[PDB]
Design a protein around this ligand. Sequence first.
Ligand SMILES: CC(C)[C@H](C)[C@@H](O)[C@H](O)[C@@H](C)[C@H]1CC[C@H]2[C@@H]3COC(=O)[C@H]4C[C@H](O)[C@H](O)C[C@]4(C)[C@H]3CC[C@]12C
Ligand SMILES: Nc1ncnc2c1ncn2[C@@H]1O[C@H](COP(=O)(O)OP(=O)(O)NP(=O)(O)O)[C@@H](O)[C@H]1O
Ligand SMILES: Nc1ncnc2c1ncn2[C@@H]1O[C@H](COP(=O)(O)OP(=O)(O)NP(=O)(O)O)[C@@H](O)[C@H]1O
Ligand SMILES: [Mg+2]
Ligand SMILES: [Mg+2]
Length: 1165
Amino acid sequence: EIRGVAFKELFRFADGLDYVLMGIGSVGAFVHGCSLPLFLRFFADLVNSFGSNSNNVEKMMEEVLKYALYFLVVGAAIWASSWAEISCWMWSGERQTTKMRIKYLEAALNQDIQFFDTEVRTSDVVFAINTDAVMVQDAISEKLGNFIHYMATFVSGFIVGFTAVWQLALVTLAVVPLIAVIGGIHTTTLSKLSNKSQESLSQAGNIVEQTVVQIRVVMAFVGESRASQAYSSALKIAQKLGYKTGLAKGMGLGATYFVVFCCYALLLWYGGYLVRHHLTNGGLAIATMFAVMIGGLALGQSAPSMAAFAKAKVAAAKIFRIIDHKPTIERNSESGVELDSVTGLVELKNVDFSYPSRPDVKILNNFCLSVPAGKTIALVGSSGSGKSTVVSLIERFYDPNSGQVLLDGQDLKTLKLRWLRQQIGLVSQEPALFATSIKENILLGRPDADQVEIEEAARVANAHSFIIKLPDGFDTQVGERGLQLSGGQKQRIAIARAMLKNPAILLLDEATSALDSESEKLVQEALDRFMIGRTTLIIAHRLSTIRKADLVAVLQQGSVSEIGTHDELFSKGENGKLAFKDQANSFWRLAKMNSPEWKYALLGSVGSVICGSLSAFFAYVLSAVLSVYYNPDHEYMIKQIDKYCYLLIGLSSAALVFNTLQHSFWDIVGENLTKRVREKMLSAVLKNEMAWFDQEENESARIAARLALDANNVRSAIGDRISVIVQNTALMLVACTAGFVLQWRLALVLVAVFPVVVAATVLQKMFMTGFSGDLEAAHAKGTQLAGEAIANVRTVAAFNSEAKIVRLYTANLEPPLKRCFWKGQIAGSGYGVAQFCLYASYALGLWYASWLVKHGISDFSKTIRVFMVLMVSANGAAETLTLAPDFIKGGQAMRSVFELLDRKTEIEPDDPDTTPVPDRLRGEVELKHIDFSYPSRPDIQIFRDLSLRARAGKTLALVGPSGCGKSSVISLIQRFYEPSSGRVMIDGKDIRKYNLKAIRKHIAIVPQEPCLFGTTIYENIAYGHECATEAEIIQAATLASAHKFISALPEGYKTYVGERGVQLSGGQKQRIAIARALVRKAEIMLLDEATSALDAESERSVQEALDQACSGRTSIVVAHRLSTIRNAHVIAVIDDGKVAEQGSHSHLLKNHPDGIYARMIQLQR
Ligand SMILES: CC(C)[C@H](C)[C@@H](O)[C@H](O)[C@@H](C)[C@H]1CC[C@H]2[C@@H]3COC(=O)[C@H]4C[C@H](O)[C@H](O)C[C@]4(C)[C@H]3CC[C@]12C
Ligand SMILES: Nc1ncnc2c1ncn2[C@@H]1O[C@H](COP(=O)(O)OP(=O)(O)NP(=O)(O)O)[C@@H](O)[C@H]1O
Ligand SMILES: Nc1ncnc2c1ncn2[C@@H]1O[C@H](COP(=O)(O)OP(=O)(O)NP(=O)(O)O)[C@@H](O)[C@H]1O
Ligand SMILES: [Mg+2]
Ligand SMILES: [Mg+2]
């Protein structure tokens, strides 16, 4: 394991302004931490004066007034200190992390490629530049400030408590570890159970994704019920674990409240004892209690900052490892010859290169090549041969280990590297389009070029096409969408950027076969205008290229068999605001679906009120005890203290029990609602039709994200909302009742100021959490730009565009920096204002209590009880942070779930209408005058008045070009889609009237590219029939001939398959799909081009399956190749979305002889 760097090195990028910001933030954090208990000290002084000076009214008034002014001063100090701390720390962290990322990227680009090969790899580099960067940022921005603040709080609290009453300081210090340990155990248990629940829900989402991706087969069968069962089982596990999480949370809250109650019972009794012996005052006792508790909790809260410190030390050690690494291969040597002879006469001879990762494996064996000037040369590289390797050696990506490698007769390492890479132009198979605009991509090709050069490169170098037809034109961010560009267009953009680097030799790479001819002809015309551009990769396709290049040589085992011009080089491997009333109605709908759990809810509700009451009750007790401390009769003091302590001890157990009950029952109700919603959501999705599935915004991963997110935030927005609204209502109700019946005037004033103090305490809790936004989202654009640059480092080195990439990264990062600065300023100012208002309200209320006492309106006891009870109950109510307030997004997610459930499918998966279902289908599907138009693309309409025939005891074959919708034909066979105007007779009647599920169970199909379902081959094969037993799957395997390699598998039918399982061959998976089709034993066997996407033994297997299919009922088989359609007796025609003839191939030749398919047959020969 690598060793983390020392703490100081974290601040390597800190400049003078950063040091100033860090100092100011440290001072602010220290002042904040010290001010938290200093207020308690001032409160103790005020209370002691206001209680002792009852007889002397005027002195009491002046004392209370001066201490209220002290409260205002403390409020202002907290305002300023919190503002400075938050703003300075956040902005300094951002300012340092930005420079760190810039240096990291700059160091990364100008490294060697073999460095990425041997040492840290590109994926690790990206993972670092995201996670380690954000980790160090959060550690040095907020964690450090919080650590300083909490250490200050701890020290100041200890000092205040001890110097006030060392005795209670010692006792409370003994108390604190209990509460700290309880809180730590609670947090740890919650985190562990949260991780467990997260992984369980991830599993359930995995079932969701695998179902939605594979919806084709799922609807082809009746397996939606199976998917629902699997989802229900996963959700059952998740909900049982969820029950456990709720119980743990309830026990944690109950235990901490129990220990708090007992501990304050003991502390209050001891404080009464101390006051009785004239050791101290009541106010000093209370202040010591609170201050010592605050200090201990502050140390507890400070520890996580140390954890983050260690993690950031490791992360920054990694980052500095990449940063400090020195480029091994010397680059940009000043010995650059700067040859004026751009023509490369001779190069790449006696080349003995070996790949760095495996130096023993010598890829290139004494390679020699000429590449004469004035003429283009092509290379026939084998797949195992290093065509990319020799290209890299040309580009100087790697240095040849020995060998007489040279260029134009003047070597490579002699004449610099930047200039040489400028001389050579490269195109790549994968276009290198970064996040920036396409015009900026052209600039990245050659920054010296102006806009007119870009236009002409879009005019003469390439044709004017969609690359210009973007709505923004050339100023369009290709990275943000990507799907907008086809792939040929971005390839032509790369061609253009290469055209900018016109001079001297220009290497060419291979292009995919599935590429437009326009890009290809642009490539060859670039070749014609660039005779000095050579090394075109034929790859047995686009033979015009090999026509252009006279010198052609093949490459194998790091050597060339022949050297010279064109020859017989073929057959040697050649191949191819929003409304709220609807919110109330939908809330009623949710509650209605939550009806069965009502009992639990009711019980939970009951627990809530009791919990709330006890919280407020607790406050009152403190109040009363404080009021008792300033009483002359010490015996009456003893009686009151004993009564209150006994009552507190008695109610501690009630607090424990009712916290557990409330949380357990509320969380159980939520889990049931969540699972119930999930099931209904999945069922509604499955009832929908694929015309909705293929539509964008219905992708499998996106659907699963919808399912998870909406479910969880709905359960929050119901359960947490009800629990909060009931519990805090009861708490403030009983608190205000006590306050009113004691002194309604002071109670009314404090009720008026109540929302302010509640908001301030909520903000204190949020500050404890941290005000930093979602940094990864803020840096997302620069993040993905840097990731693309790092992954595509070869292309960046090819155009030596590291400086431009760094500049674009800086430009991307700048607006997030400014936004972060302003967000920090706003957050600091708002938090400070809230705290100042809180302390001003404290001062106002307490001074008003003094004023009431002056006029004889009330007494010290009643006023102090009212003030203390209402303020502590306000803190208890602002403890609202315990339950997550996701309601804001909860409403949107809830309208989302209701619109998804309320969405109607036009094709009913099950037809309610009566249908004349036969046991054995008549198997004579009758396509006639079909004019199907694809819904997704109304422009493309495959079918024009198509009429087809079926053969009951026989089979029909179909053949055509890849363009024709044969898979569309089989889709319309099973009512997968809906024809625009065509009509089809499956059973002497419309398919639309007859039940769809009966159609599914009566028709078996194979997909063109079948993929398997689950762990065991047994279940995947048995999927075809609802009762496959064991024998039926036996002959299903044998007739399909899958059984031989199934037995070759370790455990056969139980062998785990999938991404993590034994990944069978395409032929094997297609054959077992055939086996499943046989399992279904259906009337119509739809054997699509899977009968061609296979191998020779699978080809005889398919011929045998055709034998059985013609023997048993009927089949529609499509296969563009020959020798398979000949098996079927009757063969149809599907050319250009039209039928031309139908019958046997002998019949297809007796009338309408030859044909496009016959020409294909001659070709396949
Ligand atoms: C004198 C008060 C009215 C004062 C003005 C008030 O603002 C002050 O912040 C009060 C409400 C705080 C000061 C110390 C706090 C306590 C800190 O010490 C404790 O024992 C902790 C333990 C545990 O965290 C409890 O959940 C809260 C609990 C029990 C806190 C309850 C609220 C306080 C009692
Ligand atoms: N990242 C790599 N790690 C190890 N060996 C590599 C790497 N890249 C290429 N090679 C080796 O380089 C040789 C040729 O590269 P390879 O990727 O097999 O084919 P290619 O030159 O890209 N041609 P093709 O397969 O038709 O696309 C083989 O010996 C590879 O093992
Ligand atoms: N959702 C869709 N919306 C619009 N057009 C579609 C859709 N799905 C497929 N197509 C069209 O269907 C045609 C493809 O025909 P298809 O029968 O799927 O053969 P293929 O998959 O291209 N070749 P092959 O694998 O040999 O069967 C193209 O015109 C596609 O654009
Ligand atoms: Mg290659
Ligand atoms: Mg098709």
